[PDB]
Write a protein that binds this ligand. Structure first.
Ligand SMILES: Nc1nc(=O)c2c([nH]1)NC[C@H](CCc1ccc(C(=O)N[C@@H](CCC(=O)O)C(=O)O)cc1)C2
Ligand SMILES: Nc1nc(=O)c2c([nH]1)NC[C@H](CCc1ccc(C(=O)N[C@@H](CCC(=O)O)C(=O)O)cc1)C2
Ligand SMILES: *Cc1c(COP(=O)(O)O)cnc(C)c1O
Ligand SMILES: *Cc1c(COP(=O)(O)O)cnc(C)c1O
Ligand code: NA
Lengths: 454, 453
């Protein structure tokens, strides 16, 4: 035993699973707006000897030796990150160690706040992330709500936009120390100027969490949160198209009397929260950030925008209703209540024909436990060189699933009744097997980033 | 642009840095006891298309579709985890999503404790981990000590062992809800049974954090904390030799029922983490299948012999070992009797391609410069080192120490020592000579992983 044997030779059971997953990614229409396909280049860094190095601490400030190379990788990754978002090294630092996006948010809260200090974020069912503070009527759900005190802000249910007026009204009363501008399920741009005004008045930190839209911001195809935000967190996957990791950007240098974010942020990441960095992820992130700086990527991102509105316009023209009426970014929120269906039903139909989308609770939902809609994203299929006509055809395939769903709803009662009918009625099975086969044939023909076979 | 281009073609700056790190690993004597060299098979899973799949939730209970294969991988990882540590699925379950060891511990704490509830772990300078709670005189350092209330327990400096008697005395007073049995820098076997007695008495959960020893435990070459703990955390790297990632094992079934399963799983997701890193989960599954083999038992036996051999060789050269020796994968050297400290020895050794880390000696305070050195066998044993090779590692260390002594007699401060090693041309030649001999020696041995990166 050397540990140089191949995966295919040494663990055939696992190799076959990697192949089935690769095949599933190739044959499918991936419409989850968080999802993307990482480059082979970055996957080579991720699957490297960099996994073997413990480098607790920071460049030049390590707790032990042998980190000279790993130091250059970290410092390179930082510079590439600041470059990717057109940030001045004098006015912005960045931490590249967070293990994912959720750790990155937790680290900011523990860096800047005391336990039980107050946080405001977009409510989860209005399109906020778990890590922005989310608790239910029964219990505290996100650890953000356990260790800190979160009150959500909300959508104006008329417009489907962020009710910025209520946020200002309500932040005056709640007195948050930190307010979060960022979304998991929101088709429009965030008014970061208006967020900073609220934050300036109530004397809160503004945290922009651009996870979903970080690629679009780097490419400069939407306006940048960095103009108005103190702190920016993000994933390195999603629209940045990297390996799974996280980043924390923070302002540094002179405020008005210096900013004091850098030392607090870095300390919270290590030694407070994390152990050894995942230097392999850091390197794959650096690879992906270089790719993000190129004109290729600006074109990718522009196509992401165009593909999204092509999907929107297409859905409007098949008569579907959209939350907020459309999109200014990489996704579309489809309200299926005005079509006489819901998200739960649509999802399971779409799934069975290799179309993968996300449920979305919409403003107009009459039932709190059945989501009304669906999030549909461009980035993943755009990375497979999809264009407007290809997304029109995606929308076309979706419409068939919806229409099966509508037909199965009137021949069923409950939601578990719905899902069993999809499996056991031969006439429904066959129409599903047919649509699936046509979807997989359509999808397979497009190129796919990464390795050929895993 | 396809995203199918190779790394060497598309990003030569990064590919050159990967190649330097690979050469550094190949030419060095890696003695950091938490280090190991991950198999190629596992790294192929790590750098894979499994990076591309969001699968928030758990097998059969995901928040969205497309997870048929990812469910199978996660479920397979769980089966192999329970297999590696010889656990009955009726009595034990396992969560495979923690992003690393430190996340695994925070998730256990948020599952079982309220904010500000009480925790006890081995003090950091006595050999515990940051995540077991750590505060200086001046401030709270570990998040474990911010969100929870940490009080450490200590070694008996007389024996270098954990003072189980003072733990029992002091836990009766402090009333911890959770006590941690596990170490970063400790050469001996933990008396888990005694930890369990103290826990039962004060009505506290016993957590074994076995990160350093997990592979030894898997191979059944040391006693298993699973006989006595309710919860067991571990890294998947270190002695398990997998990708960086974490595990939380927990009791289930009866004694009426255990309530860890749902609380642990919920703490991991949705409370703390987001989407799991399925690529790491697959790498971990690969390393766990390796961990069940007779090969791995032979490896883990060898790690013990190699550490023994390193200890005996150090003793025969007149070095002091904290606790007198070792029953595990590492040895703790006390260099004060020799006239040198850990900070000096660490830096000399680093320059001759031997990586170790400094270690506070029992009875000293963090403020005094650490008197010792932590030396581990797992990494080099993965490169097929045997007992004679570790004797030879100790020869090289002895030269390093002997140089450090000469430089100490010619320098005043520590910063003085450190730039005398660089600028004084006679000692830098003596170092360059040793470095080359060390690197020659080390390069001969095989290395797990890919050839060039
Ligand atoms: N906008 C948005 N942000 C997000 O972070 C996520 C999404 N959507 N969608 C998918 C996933 C879901 C997160 C998530 C998990 C649990 C509960 C929850 O309410 N759990 C309670 C009560 C459930 C019930 O009423 O039956 C529980 O204790 O089980 C809510 C949301 C993550
Ligand atoms: N046994 C053990 N467990 C561990 O988890 C680690 C080790 N050793 N060794 C390396 C690293 C050590 C982490 C670590 C971090 C901060 C301080 C600390 O005391 N910080 C104070 C004052 C220190 C000083 O005066 O230099 C501060 O400045 O906030 C100590 C140790 C991780
Ligand atoms: C997806 C996301 C995150 C982080 O998710 P991880 O799975 O932890 O990487 C954080 N914030 C927002 C707004 C997100 O959409
Ligand atoms: C190394 C270690 C950890 C943490 O592992 P990371 O992957 O560095 O977060 C936790 N506990 C113990 C006992 C360890 O040795
Ligand atoms: Na590329």
């Amino acid at each position: 035993w050397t540990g140089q044997e191949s995966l295919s030779d040494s663990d055939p059971e696992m190799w076959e699973l990697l192949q089935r997953e690769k095949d599933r990614q190739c044959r499918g229409l991936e419409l989850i707006a968080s999802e993307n396909f990482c480059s082979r280049a970055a996957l080579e860094a991720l699957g490297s000897c960099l996994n073997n190095k413990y480098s607790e601490g920071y460049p030049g400030k390590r707790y032990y030796g042998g980190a000279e190379v790993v130091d250059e990788i970290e410092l390179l990754c930082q510079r590439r990150a600041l470059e990717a978002f057109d940030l001045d090294p004098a006015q912005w630092g960045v931490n590249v160690q967070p293990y994912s996006g959720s750790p990155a948010n937790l680290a900011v809260y523990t860096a800047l706040l005391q336990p039980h200090d107050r946080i405001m974020g977009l409510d989860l069912p209005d399109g906020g992330h778990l890590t922005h503070g989310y608790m239910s009527d029964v219990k505290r759900i996100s650890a953000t709500s356990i260790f800190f005190e979160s009150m959500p802000y909300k959508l104006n249910p008329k417009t489907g936009l962020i009710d910025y007026n209520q946020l200002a009204l309500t932040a005056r009363l709640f007195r948050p120390r930190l307010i979060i501008a960022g979304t998991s399920a929101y088709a429009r741009l965030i008014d970061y100027a208006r967020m900073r005004e609220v934050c300036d008045e109530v004397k809160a930190h503004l945290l922009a969490d651009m996870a979903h839209i970080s690629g679009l911001v780097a490419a400069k195809v939407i306006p940048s949160p960095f103009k108005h935000a103190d702190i920016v967190t993000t994933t390195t996957h999603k629209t940045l198209r990297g390996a799974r990791s996280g980043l924390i950007f923070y302002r540094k240098g002179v405020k008005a009397i210096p900013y004091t974010f850098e030392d607090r942020i870095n300390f919270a990441v290590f030694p407070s929260l994390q152990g050894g960095p995942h230097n392999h992820a850091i390197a794959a992130v650096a690879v992906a950030l270089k790719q993000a700086c190129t004109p290729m990527f600006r074109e990718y991102s522009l196509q992401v925008l165009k593909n999204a509105r092509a999907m929107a316009d297409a859905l409007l023209e098949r008569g579907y209703s959209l939350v907020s009426g459309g999109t200014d970014n990489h996704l579309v929120l489809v309200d299926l209540r005005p079509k006489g269906l819901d998200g739960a039903r649509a999802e399971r139909v779409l799934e069975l024909v290799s179309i993968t989308a996300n449920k979305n609770t919409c403003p107009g939902d009459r039932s709190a436990i059945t989501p009304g809609g669906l999030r549909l994203g461009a980035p993943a299929l755009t990375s497979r060189q999809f264009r407007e006509d290809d997304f029109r055809r995606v929308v076309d395939f979706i419409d068939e699933g919806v229409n099966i769903g509508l037909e199965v709803k009137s021949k069923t009662a409950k939601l578990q009744d719905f899902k069993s009918f999809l499996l056991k009625d031969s006439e429904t099975s066959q129409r599903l097997a047919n649509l699936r086969q046509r979807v997989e044939q359509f999808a397979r023909a497009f190129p796919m980033p990464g390795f050929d076979e895993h």
